[PDB]
Amino acid sequence: TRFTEEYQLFEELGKGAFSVVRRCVKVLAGQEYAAKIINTKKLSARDHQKLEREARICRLLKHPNIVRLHDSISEEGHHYLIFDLVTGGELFEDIVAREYYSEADASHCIQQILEAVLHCHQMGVVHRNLKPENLLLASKLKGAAVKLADFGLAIEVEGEQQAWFGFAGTPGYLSPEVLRKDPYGKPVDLWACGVILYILLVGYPPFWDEDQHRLYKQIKAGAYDFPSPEWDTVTPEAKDLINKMLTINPSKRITAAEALKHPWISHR
């Protein structure tokens, strides 16, 4: 009963199958949080495992560019995952408002995303759901820190061991190996980084179709390009890092560590 006692619920931030995220205040502390509220009334054994998995992964990850679990509280019929509140809104919103980022701004943004990803991978965590909606800005001030959020689809892996872990992710950001239904792991996250970096620089995605089956065909084939006019003044080094991220063969795809040493990120 530690949640009902100490915390007051305010506005809804988002909604899932069996869950809700709401701003909350720890009343006696005068401090606000993001409460993920999971309804556990007659929850399946599998859905319990997925709650426990997310709790375990979120406790594991301590990094400036990853949302921080503050507490995990089991009450009768509800579970509470309390996270530090990030108030600058989604990277998605900021790209749409600004249209696109400068190469300097994009590099600084993608650098922080890669540090979050590197940390996850080093800790045996694959997110599987990287996209601008899942990256939160620390504030509305320019250059404010980016935080990886929403580990609801995250998996635990054993070192470099890969398997068919099942079909999960967001269409525009899905890796070819997930769509092919082939073994996968940490590299899926780097494919998504490539989609995000592409979006940062020109403000529209590399893969899009009204027909999902045609979208999947373009992703599986790596059928992206750099059309005029928006790509006309973009450096080849930016394109090079995107190409290495959007590599079909996950064995040959650039890693987080390798990406952070790419000149377009490190010589800067």
């Binding site: 759901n129 079909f167 999960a168 992710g169 525009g172 529209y204 995605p205 893969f207 899009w208 089956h213």
Partner: peptide, 15 residues
């Protein structure tokens, strides 16, 4: 022409 749109996650194959 390609557009930036919000998209929902899938936790299983959806045709």
């Amino acid at each position: 022409r390609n557009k930036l749109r919000r998209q929902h996650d899938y936790d299983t194959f959806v045709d």
